[PDB]
Amino acid sequence: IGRSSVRPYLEECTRRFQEMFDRHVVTRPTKVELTDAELREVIDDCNAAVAPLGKTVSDERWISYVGVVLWSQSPRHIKDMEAFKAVCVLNCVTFVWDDMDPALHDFGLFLPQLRKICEKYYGPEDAEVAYEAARALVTSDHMFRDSPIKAALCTTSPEQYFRFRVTDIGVDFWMKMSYPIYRHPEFTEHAKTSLAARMTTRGLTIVNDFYSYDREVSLGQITNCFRLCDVSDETAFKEFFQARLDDMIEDIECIKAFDQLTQDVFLDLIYGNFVWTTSNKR
Amino acid sequence: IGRSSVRPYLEECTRRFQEMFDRHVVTRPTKVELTDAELREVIDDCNAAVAPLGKTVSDERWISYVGVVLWSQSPRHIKDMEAFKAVCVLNCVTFVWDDMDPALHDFGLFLPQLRKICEKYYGPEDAEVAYEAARALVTSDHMFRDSPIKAALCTTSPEQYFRFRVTDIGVDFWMKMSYPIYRHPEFTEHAKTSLAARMTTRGLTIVNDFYSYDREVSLGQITNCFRLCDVSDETAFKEFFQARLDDMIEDIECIKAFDQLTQDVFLDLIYGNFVWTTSN
Ligand code: NA
Ligand code: NA
């Protein structure tokens, strides 16, 4: 990767992200703890869904995927643990699908597994909303592989890039499968209009992109907001990073105008995602 | 702000918007012609949908609303005229609902009517996608009236304002009811991810906001991007307006990376909306 690396800024940016969250969010993420029985159930369902694909995945690997759900949901407000388990399974199986060679992507085998998961854990209406979101995300992933549109949106400006990431980073899917956990009519509506996703996209994506940059550029991946700046130039990098923190701050201050429960969930998502992303486990 | 106006800029901004579309889109909108029978079918369904509200709407009002669909769809690519009629009806009855005293908003009576429209004109899955978009939009409006969240998103920055308008100005609804008109797999997916709405929100909202500004500020409505600048300050106004034209241009040039049918639809929507808005 040569000088296209954020390694020189890794510690300072980690410190600044945390400082920002401490100043602006205050409430520290907590990890939801599943019983051994609940985790086993989650993992069994994950294994079942990827079995048709001939994937064997260890518990260790599943638990490494699931941690983002354990850290980035909002334990204060959980009301439906069946829905919580659905989010665990769906998150994990999607990560596995995403890590597969796309030439092995058999949608005909995988999509009915997603449907079977949703029907197990959600009521009829919610199962359809979660399933459609999952189907929309994997379909978009397939459409945007080596696509000129992805190139155009990702390289034009931060505005076009984040617009693309509202779907691509997975947060619209996340919101559409997570609202049944909270049974909160306002949150449910913000999830369904995708306003929830639009509010949280930058705080999730900027953190994810920062910590994935070196790995991605080494693999020739273009979907990272830091590709819009000359990371090798400390002055240009610091300018850009400050602009991204300011974006995160503006979003967070606006999130604080939503009703209390909704803003707890949105902020626990953005902050919890950062805690997980930086964890030794991750 | 209550007595502000963009009247002094009306002619110049109209010319500039048109000049921009001529330079960046080139292909001009054309109006879909409904047969007499199709227009009567649309009007009859509109009337039926709003009848339970005790709402009496003139044919001329229906026609004034339906013109946005006739001008802003993409005639070169229309495949399914039943879907097209559904968008006519859904568009018109949502306008009428929007124009009513919200105290008269009986969702119990209105939502089953929207469901009936969707079930008449769309196949089963598309009927569900359209109805859910309609329901989300009208439920959103009800949640945001006088909400501190709307205030926050509309006054903070253009980024927050447009983010709110992806839903609030109706474009996500429009895409999710319009894809069955085209039956084009790529467009259908961009509509269902809402990328379609994200790409076209600024070009629709900046135009709608400019021409609705005087009416809206006089009614204390805060959902207008021009309230983010002092329209009484000519230099400030020109700077702001140029920034919004630059936003529209950037979205349009990015839209041209999409597949040809999809870009045709997106650009016909933004440019058609401008043509209808200026004639209505
Ligand atoms: Na948390
Ligand atoms: Na047109």
UniProtKB/Swiss-Prot annotation, chain A:
Disulfide bonding pattern of the chain: none
Effect of W276G: Produces 3,7,18-dolabellatriene
Swiss-Prot/TrEMBL cofactor(s): Mg(2+)
Alphabetically ordered keywords of this record: Isomerase, Lyase, Magnesium, Metal-binding
Top-level EC class as recorded in UniProt: lyase
Effect of D99E: Abolishes activity, no product
Record: residues binding Mg(2+) 1: D98
Catalytic activity as recorded in UniProt: geranylgeranyl diphosphate + H2O = cyclooctat-9-en-7-ol + diphosphate
Residues the record lists as binding Mg(2+) 2: D98
Keyword Cell membrane in record: no
Effect of D101E: No change in product (cyclooctat-9-en-7-ol)
EC number per UniProt: 4.2.3.146
GO molecular function: isomerase activity; lyase activity; metal ion binding
Motif segment (NSE/DTE motif): 208-216
Motif DDXXD motif location, chain numbering: 98-101
Residues given in the record as Mg(2+) 3 binding sites: N208, S212, E216
Cofactor note: Binds 3 Mg(2+) ions per subunit.
Membership in a protein family: Belongs to the terpene synthase family.
Function: Catalyzes the cyclization of the linear isoprenoid intermediate geranylgeranyl diphosphate to tricycclic cyclooctat-9-en-7-ol in the cyclooctatin biosynthesis pathway. Cyclooctatin is a potent inhibitor of lysophospholipase.
Miscellaneous comment text of the record: 3,7,18-dolabellatriene produced by the Trp288Gly mutant has potential antibiotic activity against multidrug-resistant S.aureus (MRSA).
Record's subunit section: Homodimer.
The protein, known as: Cyclooctat-9-en-7-ol synthase
Species annotation: Streptomyces melanosporofaciens
Upper taxonomic lineage: Bacteria, Bacillati, Actinomycetota, Actinomycetes, Kitasatosporales
Gene of this entry: CotB2
